[PDB]
Amino acid sequence: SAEERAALERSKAIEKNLKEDGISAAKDVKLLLLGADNSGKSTIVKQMKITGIVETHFTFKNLHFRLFDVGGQRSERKKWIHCFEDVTAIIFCVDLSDHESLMLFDSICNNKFFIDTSIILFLNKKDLFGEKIKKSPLTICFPEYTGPNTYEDAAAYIQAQFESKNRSPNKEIYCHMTCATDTNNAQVIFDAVTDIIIANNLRGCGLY
Partner 1 sequence: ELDQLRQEAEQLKNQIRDARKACADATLSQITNNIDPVGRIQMRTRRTLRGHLAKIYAMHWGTDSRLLVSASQDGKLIIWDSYTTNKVHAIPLRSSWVMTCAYAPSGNYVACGGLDNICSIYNLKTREGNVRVSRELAGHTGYLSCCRFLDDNQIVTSSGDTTCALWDIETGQQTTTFTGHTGDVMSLSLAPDTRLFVSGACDASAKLWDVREGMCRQTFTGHESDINAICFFPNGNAFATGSDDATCRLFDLRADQELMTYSHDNIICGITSVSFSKSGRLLLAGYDDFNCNVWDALKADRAGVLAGHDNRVSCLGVTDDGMAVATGSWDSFLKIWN
Partner 2 sequence: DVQLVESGGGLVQPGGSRKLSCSASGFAFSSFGMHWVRQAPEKGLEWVAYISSGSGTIYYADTVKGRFTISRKNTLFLQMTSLRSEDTAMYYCVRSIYYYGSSPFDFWGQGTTLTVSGSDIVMTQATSSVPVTPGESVSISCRSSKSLLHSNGNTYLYWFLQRPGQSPQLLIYRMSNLASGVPDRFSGSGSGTAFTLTISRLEAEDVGVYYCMQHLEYPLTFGAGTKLELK
Partner 3 sequence: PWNEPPVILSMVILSLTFLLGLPGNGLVLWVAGLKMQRTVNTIWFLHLTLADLLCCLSLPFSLAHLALQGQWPYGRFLCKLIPSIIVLNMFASVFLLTAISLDRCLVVFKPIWCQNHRNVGMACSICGCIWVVAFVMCIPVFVYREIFTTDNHNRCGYTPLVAITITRLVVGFLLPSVIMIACYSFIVFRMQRGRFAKSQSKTFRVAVVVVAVFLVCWTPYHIFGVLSLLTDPETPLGKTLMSWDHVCIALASANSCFNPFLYALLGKDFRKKARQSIQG
Residue ranges binding partner 2 (CB under 8 A): 2-7, 9-10, 13
Long-range contacts of 5-11 (CB under 8 A, 24+ apart): none
Task: Tell me: does residue 83 bind partner 1 (CB under 8 A).
Answer: yes
Binding mask 20-49 for partner 3 (x = CB under 8 A): ---x--xx-x--------------------
Pick from partner 1, partner 2, partner 3, none: which does 51 bind, CB < 5 to 8 A by kind?
A: partner 1
First and final CA of the chain: distance in angstroms? Answer: 51
Which of these ranges, 35-43, 70-78, 144-152, 173-181, lies near partner 1 under the rule CB under 8 A?
A: 70-78
Mapping DSSP onto H, E and C, the string for 57-105 reads EEECCCCEEEEEECCCCCCCHHHCHHHHCCCCEEEEEEECCCCHHHHHH
Pick from partner 3, partner 2, partner 1, none: which does 50 bind, CB < 5 to 8 A by kind?
A: none
In whole angstroms, give the CA distance from residue 103 to residue 108. 9
Pick from partner 1, partner 3, partner 2, none: which does 204 bind, CB < 5 to 8 A by kind?
A: partner 3
In whole angstroms, give the CA distance from residue 136 to residue 157. 16
Site for partner 3 in 103-132 (CB under 8 A): none
In whole angstroms, give the CA distance from residue 34 to residue 89. 11
- The angle subtended at Cα 192 by Cα 188 and Cα 193, nearest 5°, is 115
Task: Tell me: does residue 163 bind partner 3 (CB under 8 A).
Answer: no
Which of these ranges, 91-99, 104-112, 125-133, 192-200, lies near partner 3 under the rule CB under 8 A?
A: 192-200
> Which residues of the chain form contacts with partner 1 (CB under 8 A)?
4, 7-8, 10-11, 14-15, 17-19, 21-22, 25, 51-53, 70, 73-76, 79-80, 83, 86
